[PDB]
């Protein structure tokens, strides 16, 4: 049965690039404090490049058809095309619009496509419009469907610009296909399970420490290591990690036991990583990859391997629960545990050890979204202010 | 009405103001009589 | 009528011209004044 898109349900658009004749999909990206400017983020690397999706993710709010949108200016359902929809940016919390102040990216007639957070006017509202013939008017919309969007306000399509040596979204007169991909579906979540793209703490066996980067003594060599601390660390910022999949399709599905994500520090913005010393560190996401980033959540501390299991799409099956489940976690390609290192604030250094200790069961804590809306707002402040102070200094 | 609106705001896009004013701003050449007296006219259909 | 032409007149910018197709657009005062320059010329605004 194939799935089909409905409100409330969590999608990135992405959309194809053929820069020096070569195909690079592209999803829609924009960061709510700061520029509300959109920008295209690179998924076709996934392998080379962690691409970030927390500020790629859009959702359904609200649907309506031509008609019933024009009265209501003049004034959990499925989708049907040519029906105005609503797009609500989950990071921000602000909607998609189109900003009628161009940038002038050399099309004079384009307007520029941002991030609003007033829902009034139909700068917000989106019309959907099938890619071809094979999808016609009021056919309810497929997962895997292309879809053609045109701004209400400025008759524009949701356009990519080639124009610049880097690529823009923009309102345009010119038409581009978008295709969505589900991220992930509310209804379907089991509560108080881990989810894709959760931010959750590493709550250690012991329910006194919890996995942490040192503190901001401003030194980026002593953020980059990794130890377990206690105290104040559980409720501060510098203890978040968001669980990020392999999978940019489907990303908000159930966790799998045995299946490989990326570990990343929210406030840090780096990766978890294992180098060629079984060292725990943070490295950049540009040079964060595969092999040394996976890690994954094993039921019992034995080293029995289940093989590879089969990707399954849709909301999953919950089995990793908040709170109870003991996990152990694994570094998929060299196949250590993870461990205490044990230099005994604790400050008990992480090392990644081959058969691990008795003493290795992580439980998971669902951080609030408050706090980690907070540690990311920190992080972009952090980066802005720290150019800022550079430019200055120059 | 809202299509009124909308559909003055997209021709205001599509044409500025200054490229009108401009363009008004051009001015006429003016017909000449010449030293004889008679008026060296050029054709009007070939310029502005 | 007017509401349906300029939706098939936008759908397709190609019809304004060069100087507003939107891309490497001069402007119409721009364009304008190149024609200004090539009904002066004899060669561009004639066969010859």
Redesign the interface.
């Known amino acids: 049965e194939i799935q089909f898109l409905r409100t409330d349900d969590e999608v990135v658009l992405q959309c194809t690039a053929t820069i020096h004749k070569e195909q690079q999909k592209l999803c829609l990206a924009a960061e709510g404090f700061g520029n509300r400017l959109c920008f295209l983020e690179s998924t076709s690397n996934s392998k080379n490049v962690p691409p970030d999706l927390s500020i790629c993710t859009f959702v359904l709010e609200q649907s309506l058809s031509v008609r019933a949108l024009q009265e209501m200016l003049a004034n959990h359902r499925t989708l049907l095309y040519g029906h105005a929809i609503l797009l609500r940016h989950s990071y921000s919390g602000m909607y998609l619009c189109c900003l009628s102040t161009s940038r002038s990216s050399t099309d004079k007639l384009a307007f520029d496509v941002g991030l609003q957070e007033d829902t009034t006017g139909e700068a917000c509202w989106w019309t959907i419009h099938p890619a071809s013939k094979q999808r016609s008017e009021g056919e309810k919309v497929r997962v895997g469907d292309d879809l053609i969007l045109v701004s209400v306000s400025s008759e524009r399509y949701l356009h990519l610009s080639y124009g610049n040596g880097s690529l823009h979204v923009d309102a345009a007169f010119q038409q581009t296909l978008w295709s969505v991909a589900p991220i992930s579906s509310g209804s379907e979540a089991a509560q108080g399970y881990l989810i894709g793209g959760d931010v959750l703490r590493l709550l250690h066996g012991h329910m006194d420490e919890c996995l942490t980067v040192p503190s901001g003594e401003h030194g980026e060599e002593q953020r980059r290591t990794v130890h377990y601390e206690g105290g104040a660390v559980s409720v501060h910022a510098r203890s978040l990690w968001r669980l990020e999949t392999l999978r940019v399709a489907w990303s908000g599905s159930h966790i799998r036991w045995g299946q490989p994500f990326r570990l990343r520090h929210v406030t840090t913005g780096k990766y978890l990583s294992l180098m060629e010393d079984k060292n725990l560190l943070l490295m950049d996401k540009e040079k964060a990859d595969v092999k040394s980033t996976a890690f994954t959540f094993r039921s019992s501390k034995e080293k029995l391997d289940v093989g590879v299991r089969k990707e399954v799409d849709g909301m999953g099956t919950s089995e990793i629960k908040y709170g109870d489940s003991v996990c152990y976690i694994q570094h998929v390609d060299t196949g250590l545990w993870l461990t205490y290192q044990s230099v005994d604030s604790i400050q008990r250094k992480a090392i990644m050890h081959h058969e691990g200790h008795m003493d290795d069961g992580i439980s998971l804590s669902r951080s609030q979204h408050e706090e980690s809306r907070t540690a990311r707002v920190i992080r972009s402040t952090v980066f802005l202010f720290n150019r800022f102070i550079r430019g200055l200094d120059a | 009405k809202?299509?009124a609106i909308?559909?003055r705001?997209?021709?205001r896009?599509?044409?500025?103001l200054?490229?009108?004013v401009?363009?008004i701003s051009?001015a006429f050449q003016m017909p000449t009589i010449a030293k004889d007296g008679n008026v060296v006219e050029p054709d009007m259909s070939?310029?502005? | 009528n007017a509401n349906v032409v300029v939706r098939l007149l936008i759908r397709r910018p190609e019809c304004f011209g060069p100087a507003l197709r939107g891309e490497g657009g001069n402007g119409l005062l721009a364009a304008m004044e190149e024609a200004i320059k090539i009904a002066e010329d004899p060669s561009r605004d004639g066969p010859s």
Do not use: K, Q, T
Request: avoid cysteine.
């Open positions: 809202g299509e909308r559909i705001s997209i021709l896009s599509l044409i500025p200054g490229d009108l401009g363009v051009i070939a310029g502005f």
